[PDB]
Enzyme design. Structure first.
Site, PDB file in Angstrom:
ATOM      1  N   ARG D  54       0.876  -1.331  -0.006  1.00  0.00           N
ATOM      2  CA  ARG D  54      -0.110  -0.049   0.041  1.00  0.00           C
ATOM      3  C   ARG D  54       0.758   1.160   0.107  1.00  0.00           C
ATOM      4  O   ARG D  54       1.023   2.043  -1.130  1.00  0.00           O
ATOM      5  CB  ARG D  54      -1.112  -0.047   1.151  1.00  0.00           C
ATOM      6  CG  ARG D  54      -1.943  -1.114   1.115  1.00  0.00           C
ATOM      7  CD  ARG D  54      -2.091  -1.815   2.596  1.00  0.00           C
ATOM      8  NE  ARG D  54      -0.888  -2.541   2.984  1.00  0.00           N
ATOM      9  CZ  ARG D  54      -0.620  -3.804   2.341  1.00  0.00           C
ATOM     10  NH1 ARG D  54      -1.402  -4.274   1.526  1.00  0.00           N
ATOM     11  NH2 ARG D  54       0.432  -4.402   2.787  1.00  0.00           N
ATOM     12  N   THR D  55       1.337   1.522   1.214  1.00  0.00           N
ATOM     13  CA  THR D  55       2.289   2.874   1.380  1.00  0.00           C
ATOM     14  C   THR D  55       2.962   3.337   0.073  1.00  0.00           C
ATOM     15  O   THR D  55       3.374   4.355  -0.301  1.00  0.00           O
ATOM     16  CB  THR D  55       3.137   2.818   2.662  1.00  0.00           C
ATOM     17  OG1 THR D  55       2.228   2.378   3.633  1.00  0.00           O
ATOM     18  CG2 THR D  55       4.074   3.984   3.032  1.00  0.00           C
ATOM     19  N   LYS D  84      28.330  -0.043  -5.887  1.00  0.00           N
ATOM     20  CA  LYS D  84      29.201   0.908  -5.863  1.00  0.00           C
ATOM     21  C   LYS D  84      29.892   1.006  -4.697  1.00  0.00           C
ATOM     22  O   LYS D  84      30.966   0.466  -4.218  1.00  0.00           O
ATOM     23  CB  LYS D  84      28.838   2.416  -6.408  1.00  0.00           C
ATOM     24  CG  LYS D  84      28.671   2.323  -7.822  1.00  0.00           C
ATOM     25  CD  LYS D  84      29.039   3.584  -8.527  1.00  0.00           C
ATOM     26  CE  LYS D  84      29.001   3.461 -10.070  1.00  0.00           C
ATOM     27  NZ  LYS D  84      29.356   2.321 -10.657  1.00  0.00           N
ATOM     28  N   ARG D 105      12.130   4.555   3.667  1.00  0.00           N
ATOM     29  CA  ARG D 105      11.702   3.419   4.237  1.00  0.00           C
ATOM     30  C   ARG D 105      12.853   2.306   4.364  1.00  0.00           C
ATOM     31  O   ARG D 105      13.118   1.678   3.523  1.00  0.00           O
ATOM     32  CB  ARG D 105      10.601   2.656   3.468  1.00  0.00           C
ATOM     33  CG  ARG D 105       9.855   1.535   3.857  1.00  0.00           C
ATOM     34  CD  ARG D 105       8.443   1.928   4.464  1.00  0.00           C
ATOM     35  NE  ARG D 105       7.696   0.745   4.738  1.00  0.00           N
ATOM     36  CZ  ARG D 105       6.492   0.933   5.449  1.00  0.00           C
ATOM     37  NH1 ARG D 105       5.813   2.054   5.535  1.00  0.00           N
ATOM     38  NH2 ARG D 105       5.724  -0.282   5.629  1.00  0.00           N
ATOM     39  N   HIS D 134       6.675   5.691  12.545  1.00  0.00           N
ATOM     40  CA  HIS D 134       5.895   5.684  11.135  1.00  0.00           C
ATOM     41  C   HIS D 134       4.863   6.947  11.168  1.00  0.00           C
ATOM     42  O   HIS D 134       4.118   6.855  12.237  1.00  0.00           O
ATOM     43  CB  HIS D 134       5.092   4.457  10.774  1.00  0.00           C
ATOM     44  CG  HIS D 134       4.787   4.321   9.265  1.00  0.00           C
ATOM     45  ND1 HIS D 134       4.349   5.483   8.579  1.00  0.00           N
ATOM     46  CD2 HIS D 134       5.266   3.133   8.619  1.00  0.00           C
ATOM     47  CE1 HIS D 134       4.298   4.882   7.389  1.00  0.00           C
ATOM     48  NE2 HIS D 134       4.663   3.499   7.225  1.00  0.00           N
TER      49      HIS D 134
END
Ligand SMILES: [Zn+2]
Ligand SMILES: [Zn+2]
Lengths: 146, 310, 146, 310, 310
Positions: D54-55, D84, D105, D134
């Site tokens: 969702r988010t 890298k 996130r 959150h």
């Protein structure tokens, strides 16, 4: 000048900034019985120096010679009951066990419950040690966790 | 009251010069008339903590051919130290209460020196402790040079190949130096340089060395040439640069090669040596291989019997 | 007072053998002026103590701040030539600055170059300290424990 | 000039009441009313270092919808950060620029306040860090608060499953612990039953918050039922016999709820909810969690515009 | 009708001075001046076959910003090219169409001139192929050239770290090897110190280019300091004892620079730069490398519009 001890050992003449180390590396802390470490102090025989005076604490000659490498020229004014009574030199010894930390990662001198131990000997301009376990002889410098 | 009796096999620099002679005397006597009983009952853990063909097998054959019953592990896994997470210590500690001797081999350095702290009375022999040592190949090399080449002194050998890690040479190299008469010529990569802890020696030991980057150079010179496999698994991820064989001997290299001179490889040969050469005269790595039976047998006997043999 | 010098802060009332860190943990032992020690010395309060002798130098700020959790009775005697004046009290700012060994191995503020800061909800209990990046309120006891 | 604008979006326990309702109201008004010609400039990147459905889509989408686009990356897969070689900060240093706005996130906590340390002025928004915080996955439901009972004031919630780990419910007993007359109903195994330290900031007013028995009994007392997935993917081995929610939810046990109380969930769901739950005037987790649209947009705007009204 | 338009973006050693300055100037003018109603048609796909953070987000973003969108893919993950089965060309064949424009980033070189062989007419742009070239990760700094010294003419650069591998600095001693009075300052281990063949095209004019000692000494002589990451992810085993930049950069050694000289880096950075470098009127790699915006856009436009002015 610290003071005047009763009964125990004393290390007159300790290379400056080297008295903290020969103390911090060692469990001269673990020992509870009163300690007056005089880091950085006037010498008299020499110019500058360090003077340890651990009381109640006695070091026969194993922890005496182990200083050869570190404090080359030093003194043990082994004062027993307010009176000085010491005649011991920090000779270079055979091999100083249980102390250093081996450089050779693969060597089998740590990974197991076994202790450590490197053989002391004088090479050239510098000293260099050999870990008995893995016959390797690294320089007296590289033998640390840096 | 045999010398090496109840003694331990670990590092050649823990002995001397005159010390060797004893097993070798033992050995030349067996290559002659043997004794399939001499080591009966005896049980030897042939525990190997790392891979191996010739050092383990031959050794078991050096044990089986003498009467000594053995049961040791090939792979250091299906054992308690494996998935049970047991330290070598305990592992040795206990195995020592079952066998009259431990003939090991271990991936780390001086893991052998470990054993003895948890062995004691019980004899411990090493089939190489990491790149460190392999006192056991030096002996078969010992039989060769002395065998294929009369005297044991006054001669020169060309050690070439991975030296920084060749458990092999360290031992052998350090062995020879002790003898009166043996010049050293080390040919190795820029990195794989022969560890110093052997270099200095010869120096004081008056024994002189020199580094060269050719095979032909010391062609007509060296009485013997010791080549080495490259400790590929034994390498830090830096030294990995000079990986492959900076040195790979061939045929025509044998032009001005002295008669009695031969090639010696403690095997296995990875790419350093050609197969076409096996037909040649010097080809002896192979003959320098089957010696162990004899070397390890002579050796085994000794430590396992106070009284001299026959 | 006694053997005291002219200018040079002196750190008293230290929990038994905590001072030893003040030289390795704090690496203050890298100076060329006076530093005469004496740990495990008798005390008239509770148990024992430890003191460090400084010549020509005193404390600072973040060293007034680290003293806090370091020692409750820590009474730094800042002597302006034989006269103790700034007997400041060990007090740690509300804000926590890059000088701690955090236990929330999760807060990625561990393996990546960062700035070691926490929190510290000073209560009439211990000198604990809430996480700054994880606000997980723990206790300096462990965080600071070995 | 408003309070909720240019505010680093990280956590929620440090802001005042006035804020939520602020954006919360912008959402009742962004329920169906699209304004393209507005922030059609400020570019944003969708930075997904973890995995939530969702988010991610919900967000990137409102990012799209509120007139614009979304760059970002679904995972730390093809990024100079690891392959890298770079620190989560270095990346930010250069990240502030381009996508003036980005959401972070991470599978590790604290990181927010980090990336947010390596930007300078350019605005951030971390919708979940490790398992500690959150911001955006709360308000969107705080919408569902007015959707089920309007008034956010005094009520009786409930949080089943894992409650200690999850970076979602961490804002619960912290955002409302500053509201009014609210009663806390928790449900989670000992260590999970939310730490007492998130519960110690509420000591200045000491209102409701407790824990007892199974859902079977606290259902005829709930005005709001908001469970939470048992963060199966993040925890400690030291406690592995508890992958299961213990207390489940099936029509079977729920048939004793209040009257306006509805069934909500953090999402994703597994066993927490029963597929036979879909059919209930309560099962609201469907629209409950699905506010990102009407939601997020409401705040997406506000934190990037001056003196604007809707 | 202009020179830098519809030009296959691959390498840089085949174009004339006139080109860069061309787009370079469009960047001083695209420093803050967005024009949506323009190329709001020509669709582009972000094709990331490797892993670089800036160029990716920086690019896809200007792609967004200059009025449009970006399809592409972060990796050869879910693409009929491998899983299904297809050659880097086959894909192109059909790729020309849809996203009239696409950027290619392969972990193998030459590929550009390849995808660019399977398009037909539809314009391309490879911002880095294997470790041989890079067009867009130069100009963006060529911007930083005017940002630090304006005039690109005569100066004294410097390139630490890996210089032989990297597809980034490959355009250095090749784009400027056709400029004017410039002095080349290189710094990299033997094989890395850039091949003499990129250095042999400059034989027709024979201007500056040399290599000596450590940064410790060439700092009080540098007008431009542009290091380069040691391409740790692409090389040869044959040389593995050199993962470390050898010559590092810390305030400690830099406190001897010129006056307008600034510290720049290709990015990503690891040890090359010290975190304590952030605080310096020189540490410019921050904005240095961060031109993609003002940058790229400048050329993004020009290679897709006719007779246009800004
Ligand atoms: Zn060792
Ligand atoms: Zn933390």
């Amino acid at each position: 000048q610290v003071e005047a001890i009763k009964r125990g050992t004393v290390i007159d003449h300790i290379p400056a900034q080297i008295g903290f180390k020969l103390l911090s590396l060692f469990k001269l802390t673990e020992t509870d019985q009163r300690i007056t470490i005089g880091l950085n102090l006037p010498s008299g025989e020499m110019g500058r120096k360090d003077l340890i005076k651990i009381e109640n604490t006695f070091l026969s000659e194993d922890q005496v010679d182990q200083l050869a490498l570190y404090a080359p020229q030093a003194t043990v004014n082994r004062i027993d009951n307010y009176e000085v009574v010491g005649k011991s030199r920090p000779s270079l010894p055979e091999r100083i066990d249980n102390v250093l930390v081996c450089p050779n990662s693969n060597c089998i001198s740590h990974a197991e419950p076994v202790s450590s131990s490197f053989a002391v000997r004088k090479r050239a301009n510098d000293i260099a040690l050999k870990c008995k376990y893995c016959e390797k002889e690294f320089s007296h410098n590289v033998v640390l966790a840096n | 009251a045999n010398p090496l009796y109840q003694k331990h096999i670990i590092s050649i620099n823990d002995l001397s010069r005159d010390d060797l002679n004893l097993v070798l005397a033992t050995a030349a006597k067996l290559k002659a008339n043997p004794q399939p009983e001499l080591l009966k009952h005896k049980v030897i853990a042939s525990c190997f903590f790392e891979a191996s063909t010739r050092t383990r097998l031959s050794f078991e054959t050096s044990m089986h051919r003498l009467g000594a019953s053995v049961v040791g592990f090939s792979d250091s896994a299906n054992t308690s130290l494996g998935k049970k997470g047991e330290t070598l210590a305990d592992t040795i500690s206990v195995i020592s209460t079952y066998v009259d001797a431990i003939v090991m081999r271990h991936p780390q350095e001086g893991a052998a020196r470990l054993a003895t702290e948890f062995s004691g009375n019980v004899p411990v022999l090493n089939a190489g402790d990491g790149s460190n040592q392999h006192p056991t190949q030096t002996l078969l090399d010992l039989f060769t040079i002395q065998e294929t080449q009369g005297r044991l002194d006054n001669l020169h050998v060309a050690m070439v190949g991975d030296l920084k890690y060749g458990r092999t040479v360290h031992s052998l190299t350090q062995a020879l130096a002790k003898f009166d008469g043996n010049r050293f010529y080390f040919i190795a990569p820029d990195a794989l340089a022969m560890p110093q802890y052997i270099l200095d020696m010869l120096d004081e030991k008056g024994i002189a060395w020199s580094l060269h980057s050719s095979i032909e150079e010391v062609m007509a010179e060296v009485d013997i040439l010791y080549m080495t496999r490259v400790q590929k698994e034994r390498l830090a991820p830096s030294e990995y640069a000079n990986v492959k064989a900076q040195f790979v001997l061939r045929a025509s290299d044998l032009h001005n090669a002295k008669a009695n001179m031969k090639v010696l490889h403690p095997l296995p040969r990875v790419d350093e040596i050609a197969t076409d050469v096996d037909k040649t005269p010097h080809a002896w790595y192979f003959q320098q291989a089957g010696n162990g039976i004899f070397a390890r047998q002579a050796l085994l006997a000794l430590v396992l019997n106070r009284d001299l043999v026959l």
